[PDB]
Design a protein around this ligand. Structure first.
Ligand SMILES: [Zn+2]
Lengths: 35, 278, 32, 471, 286, 167
């Protein structure tokens, strides 16, 4: 199984976390420009 | 102990009569008196910067006409309120607005008159929206040279006043002088309606008017392309050996944004035929 | 275990979508 | 269809089938008494058919897996209803569920049904009621297990769970419930529930746990300059000698203490109380020199810091400190004295429901104060911590608008922050009502208020307006 | 008238502070104070003004008082400290006029032959600009009544000055500079379509006021005439603008050309450094 | 860095000599010395005896430490928000007591080596019931005795005041 594959396709969401690391990279961008 | 961190509330008509008074007498220093209300120890407000008559020979303590004190202040008593003076203003247009010898000559008279007697210093030629040119002081006395100077019991508010350490000549005058906190406090009776004046009286004025356009076609296209060839030169020189080559500059400036605002605002102007007309 | 694994990564997933949403308002404010 | 449950096909579509069932159970889980969608008998019969696969599997964490995938006590009761259910694995199943389940709707129901199955366990359990006594916060079950003490007649019986509530419950909870528990073991609860020994043995623990230094206190004792860092010297030796009650730091000065201002006097007789953290009996007779009338201060704080130090001495364990300090604050000259007795008054008066701290404080200030009106809002918040004093929403945030000073609105702001605490879902419309206010005060206090409302939880709600007002 | 006005918001705050001077006491009707002014051209300017005590009982709307001694003494002060300034009229804070205002106006037109009033609102939410100008002159009447002395809506605007917003735009802190290209056009869309055609619906409500009422001055002088200035466009059904769609195609022509060529060059802008810096940051990450 | 030994992280003494570096100047911030000897009182608060925890181990919170920090922040005025950090201090101790007042001489053992007992194997030293202090990083290594007369019946991993029974 029930949650034993839901947890796996839920592990796949760390790829969506990588896009967030690209996002915090974007907030790190231009913060020193405005500084 | 013991002395609390003070504070100068404004009404901003103070600042308006300083910009208008010092703007009117702009090639000359002026001298005046500042009205307000003694609220408590750690705060004091200014609610009225009012006009004071000119001196021609000398900007000094003799600029205060006492029959203009009785007549002016009494006609403020038969204006809506007889409030209390909180100090005095002046100007220094000719330089970077530090405390002249007149100010120390009349400071003991002004603190013989008042408790605080806080200075108001300004150069009327600084800014159009930005600078906070007004400057405020307190001559602490030389008789307290035994005790430590400027107690200011917490010095957390004063440590956060201590951010600029502004005006190194006044810092040369740090002998018995120190600036004070001035907030630009709210006036809920006035701030929102000033936002109505400001915002609604400027967003198309009547908010109905422009909703010029066929000559910014040619002006915009020449302004764009004449920059676009020198924007597109440098990919001749784009290469490898990254540190061995040195010319990094963006070439996209004012060609995204000015063209988006340009063709989108004038294509909605092309939509004003259908938007205005049916 | 299995039960704890999506009991960490779900909360990490909600948090990540939350501040991942915040980044656009950060970079929007930077331009202003 | 249901004849086959061995294929990748069928395990995918029963993974999606009990996906549909578990969204049906989370959907039906928050419905008042009924009005539920039709849970089909196929998709709930394959649930405990897969639990029969968890019994043929024998595994307890798979079975507790599906048993919480239903989000329901039916097969969750069947897991703890299995054979040889070890209360170790069942015991950190509590650590799981307490550590995980978001709502207070049925997390406490799962909790109390596990304290039921531990009442079904052969040993008379006390970790279960030791847990739900402070999570499901029962005032009657603690008196009921006290009836198990009257029946039981041991000395370990009334000791350890009594200690876990005696330090790990609310100040209002145990002091509120103690008359339900006493209205021997009857003498023993008066011994180890009054508050007369733990702070005193910890006072022994700190006078006899002294591992400190004085060389750095020389390396800042040498400092000369007129800063407030000379009161950070007594913040230093006060902090590194909290609760020792030995006075070797007041006695090395004449002028190092005599920078007589608001903060020389107050911290001078305040760090003494920081040293006298604990110190239950010798407050008055050790501070016989330091009564509010036996000092003759600079202005108000060699006398105000004394009752402040008594508040530090009787912090959260008040004896006469409601009425001794309330009558000595009522017999004060002005508002400029009442400070540390007001903060120690509300501090010792948590859950005592003191009335005069609500009464004479708003009408003590009448418009505002300097900082003792901050002490008024904080002290009423302290007696009304997390309480929703609905008279004082009106009389505090129904008050925090017409006066004009930043101090009175700032400490009233932290006061109306302090009245609400640990809500999770009990203030947020009032919080955005504080967001739609003016700039400096109420949006700030709403940040402090939801900061107190969401303590310990990873709620995704205050982070919204938190980042919104933060950037 | 008078061409128009130039009115700084400073004198509007000089109305606001005296509204604070009367809001604490018993406000009978409204504020009436002096409007000083800088009159140079047929255009107007106001840099300053002051106020004066005033009450009025509404039984014959003729018992009402200013202090002309106070007016000319403080006017002697302000004329003394500033030779530029003189009186130009008065003001009132209650946004609707009444019958006494011609007695206020004509009673203070003895000092200067014009005395313009100012409507303001201390709580404005619906108006555009607060400032308003009249002039008390006559068109006699068509029937020629005995001196129909009439206020005339001279056009009005907020004045401006260099370095007067030094306070203001630092105070408000809320301004989003250059919202061209984002949503300012649709702010003006909602407020001009809605807030223009609702005024059109109150003018057609006044047309119904001429239907069931409105015989006072049915006004067959200016209404259909400037409404025929409106009726330069009779935009009836079948729409009759066959001579405007090749015009519309000419209008759409150059702009869609600029979008085609120029936005293709906007693609040519993004693509180069986007690819180069992209794979620099991609395969130079490790 | 409260209670924190150097053997956990080496930045302890790095920041102690950093505090000496900022504390033995004059030309730093005026109240950086205030916060620096303040930071020394924090760094040796109680004598490395007390620490902070906004949360007890049993899942219950610790509201005088929560109130300790949310109180503690606003020191621009009313400085005793700093003074109220004593309310955030916790009794890191182990108490070998059985009835209510008796002293049973209990000296059990700790599995950590003497590399971690030091404040900048066989056992740790305990007393009869001050009671003994416990390192919060050493809750997992303290072990109930096999040779003492009075040994704890209910298990002992958490600190604080705990049970005891004659064996
Ligand atoms: Zn000067």
């Amino acid at each position: 199984y029930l949650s034993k594959i839901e947890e796996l396709q839920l592990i796949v969401n760390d790829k969506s976390q990588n896009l967030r690391r690209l996002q915090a990279q974007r907030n790190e961008l231009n913060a020193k420009v405005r500084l | 102990a013991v002395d609390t961190a003070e504070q100068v509330y404004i009404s901003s008509l103070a600042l308006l009569k300083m910009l208008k008074h010092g703007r009117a007498g702009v090639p000359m220093e002026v001298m005046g008196l500042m009205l307000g209300e003694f609220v408590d120890d750690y705060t004091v407000r200014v609610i009225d910067v009012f006009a004071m008559p000119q001196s021609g020979t000398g900007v000094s303590v003799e600029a205060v006409d006492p029959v203009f004190q009785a007549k002016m202040l009494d006609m403020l008593k038969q204006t809506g309120r007889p409030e209390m003076v909180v100090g005095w203003y002046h100007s220094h247009p000719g330089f970077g607005c530090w405390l002249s010898g007149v100010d120390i000559n009349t400071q003991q008279s002004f603190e013989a008159l008042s408790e605080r007697a806080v200075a108001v210093v300004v150069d009327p030629i600084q800014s159009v929206k930005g600078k906070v040119v007004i400057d405020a002081f307190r001559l602490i006395n030389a008789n307290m040279m035994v005790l430590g100077h400027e107690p200011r019991q917490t010095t957390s508010n004063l440590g956060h006043l201590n951010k600029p350490s502004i005006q190194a000549l006044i810092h040369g005058l740090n002998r018995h002088y120190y600036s004070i906190t001035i907030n630009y406090r709210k006036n809920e009776l006035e701030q929102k309606m000033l936002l109505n004046l400001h915002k609604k009286s400027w967003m198309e004025g009547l908010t109905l008017q422009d909703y010029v356009v066929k000559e910014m076609l040619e002006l915009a296209k020449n302004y764009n392309k004449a920059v676009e060839e020198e924007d597109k030169m440098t990919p001749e020189q784009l290469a490898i050996k990254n540190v061995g080559k040195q010319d990094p500059k963006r070439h996209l400036e004012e060609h995204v944004d000015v063209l988006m605002t340009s063709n989108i605002v004038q294509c909605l102007a092309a939509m004003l035929d259908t938007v205005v007309f049916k | 275990d299995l039960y704890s694994r999506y009991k960490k990564l779900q909360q990490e997933l909600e948090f990540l979508e939350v501040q991942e949403e915040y980044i656009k308002d950060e970079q929007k404010n930077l331009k202003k | 269809f249901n004849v086959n449950d061995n294929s990748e096909y069928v395990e995918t579509i029963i993974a999606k089938c009990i996906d549909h069932y578990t969204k049906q159970c989370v959907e039906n889980a928050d419905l008042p008494e009924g009005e539920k969608k039709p849970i089909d008998q196929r998709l709930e019969g394959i649930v405990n058919k897969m639990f029969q696969r968890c019994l043929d599997d024998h595994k307890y964490k798979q079975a507790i897996g599906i048993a919480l995938e239903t989000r329901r006590l039916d097969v969750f009761e069947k897991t703890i209803l299995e054979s040889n259910d070890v209360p170790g694995m069942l015991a950190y199943s509590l650590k799981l569920c307490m550590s995980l389940m978001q709502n207070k709707q049925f997390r406490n129901k799962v909790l109390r049904v596990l304290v039921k199955i531990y009442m079904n366990l052969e040993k008379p359990d006390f970790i279960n009621v030791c847990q739900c006594l402070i999570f499901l916060d029962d005032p009657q079950a603690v008196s009921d297990i006290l009836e198990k003490l009257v029946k039981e007649d041991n000395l370990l019986m009334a000791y350890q769970i009594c200690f876990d509530l005696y330090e790990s419950a609310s100040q209002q909870f145990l002091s509120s419930v103690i008359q339900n528990l006493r209205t021997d073991q009857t003498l023993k609860m008066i011994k180890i529930l009054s508050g007369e020994m733990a702070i005193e043995l910890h006072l022994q623990f700190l006078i006899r746990n002294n591992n400190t230094d004085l060389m750095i206190l020389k390396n800042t004792k040498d400092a000369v300059r007129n800063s407030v860092c000379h009161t950070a010297t007594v913040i230093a030796n006060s902090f590194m000698h909290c609760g020792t009650t030995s006075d070797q730091f007041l006695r090395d000065n004449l002028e190092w203490l005599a920078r007589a201002t608001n903060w020389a006097k107050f911290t001078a007789t305040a760090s003494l109380g920081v040293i006298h953290k604990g110190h239950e009996k010798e407050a008055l007779q050790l501070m016989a020199t330091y009564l509010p009338k036996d000092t003759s201060p600079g202005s108000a704080y060699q006398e105000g810091g004394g009752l402040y130090a008594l508040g530090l001495i009787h912090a959260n364990h008040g004896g006469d400190i409601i009425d001794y300090l309330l009558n000595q604050l009522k017999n004060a000259s002005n508002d400029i004295v009442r400070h540390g007795g007001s903060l120690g008054l509300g501090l010792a008066a948590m859950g005592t429901a003191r009335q005069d701290v609500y009464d004479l404080l708003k009408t003590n200030l009448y418009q505002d104060d300097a900082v003792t009106g901050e002490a008024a809002g904080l002290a009423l918040g302290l007696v009304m911590l997390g309480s929703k004093n609905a008279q004082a929403i009106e009389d505090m945030v129904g008050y925090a608008q017409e006066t004009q000073h930043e101090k009175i609105l700032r400490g009233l702001a932290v006061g109306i922050a302090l009245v609400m605490y640990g809500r999770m879902e009990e203030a947020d419309a009032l919080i955005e009502s504080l967001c739609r206010d003016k700039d400096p005060i109420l949006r700030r206090s709403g940040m402090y208020t939801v900061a107190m409302a969401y303590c310990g939880s990873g709620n995704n709600k205050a982070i919204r307006r938190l980042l919104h007002v933060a950037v | 008238a008078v061409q128009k006005v130039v009115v700084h918001p400073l004198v509007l705050l000089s109305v606001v502070d005296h509204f604070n001077r009367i809001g604490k006491v018993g406000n009978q009707k409204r504020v009436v104070g002096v409007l000083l002014g800088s009159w140079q051209k047929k255009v107007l300017d106001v840099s300053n003004s002051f106020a004066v005590p005033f009450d009025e009982d509404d039984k014959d709307d003729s018992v009402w008082f200013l202090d002309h001694d106070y007016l000319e003494n403080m006017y002697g002060m302000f004329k003394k400290v500033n030779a530029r300034e003189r009186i130009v009229g008065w003001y009132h804070t209650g946004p609707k006029l009444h019958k006494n205002d011609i007695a206020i106006n004509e009673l203070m037109k003895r000092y200067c032959p014009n005395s313009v009033l100012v409507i303001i609102d201390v709580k404005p939410k619906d108006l555009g600009l607060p400032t308003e100008a009249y002039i008390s002159v006559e068109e006699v009447h068509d029937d020629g009544t005995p001196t129909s002395k009439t206020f005339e809506h001279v056009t009005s605007e907020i004045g401006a000055e260099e370095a007067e917003e030094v306070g203001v735009e630092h105070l408000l802190r809320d301004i989003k500079d250059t919202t061209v290209g984002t949503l300012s056009q649709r702010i003006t869309n909602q407020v001009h379509g809605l807030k223009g055609l609702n005024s059109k619906l109150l003018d057609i409500r006044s047309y119904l006021e001429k239907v069931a009422t409105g015989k006072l001055p049915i006004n067959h002088q200016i209404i259909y005439q400037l409404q025929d200035v409106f009726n330069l466009l009779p935009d009836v059904s079948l729409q009759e603008f066959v001579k405007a769609f090749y015009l519309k195609t000419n209008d759409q022509m150059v702009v869609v050309y600029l979008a085609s060529l120029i936005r293709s060059v906007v693609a040519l802008h993004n693509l180069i450094n986007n690819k180069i810096a992209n794979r620099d940051a991609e395969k130079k990450e490790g | 860095m409260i209670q924190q030994t150097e053997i956990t992280c080496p930045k302890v003494n790095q920041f102690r000599q950093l505090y000496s570096k900022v504390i033995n100047d004059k030309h730093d911030d005026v109240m950086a010395k205030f916060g620096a000897i303040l930071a020394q009182g924090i760094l040796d608060a109680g004598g490395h005896n007390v620490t902070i925890s906004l949360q007890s181990r049993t899942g219950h919170t610790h509201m005088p430490s929560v109130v300790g920090v949310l109180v503690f922040t606003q020191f621009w005025f009313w400085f005793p928000l700093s003074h109220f950090l004593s309310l955030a201090y916790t009794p890191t101790c182990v108490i070998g007591l059985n009835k209510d007042l008796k002293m049973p001489k209990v000296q059990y053992k700790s599995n950590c080596k003497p590399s971690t007992f030091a404040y900048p194997t066989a056992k740790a030293k305990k007393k009869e019931k001050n009671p003994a202090r416990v390192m919060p990083a050493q809750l997992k290594v303290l072990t109930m005795p096999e040779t003492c007369r009075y040994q704890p019946f209910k298990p002992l991993s958490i600190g604080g005041i705990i049970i005891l029974k004659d064996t």
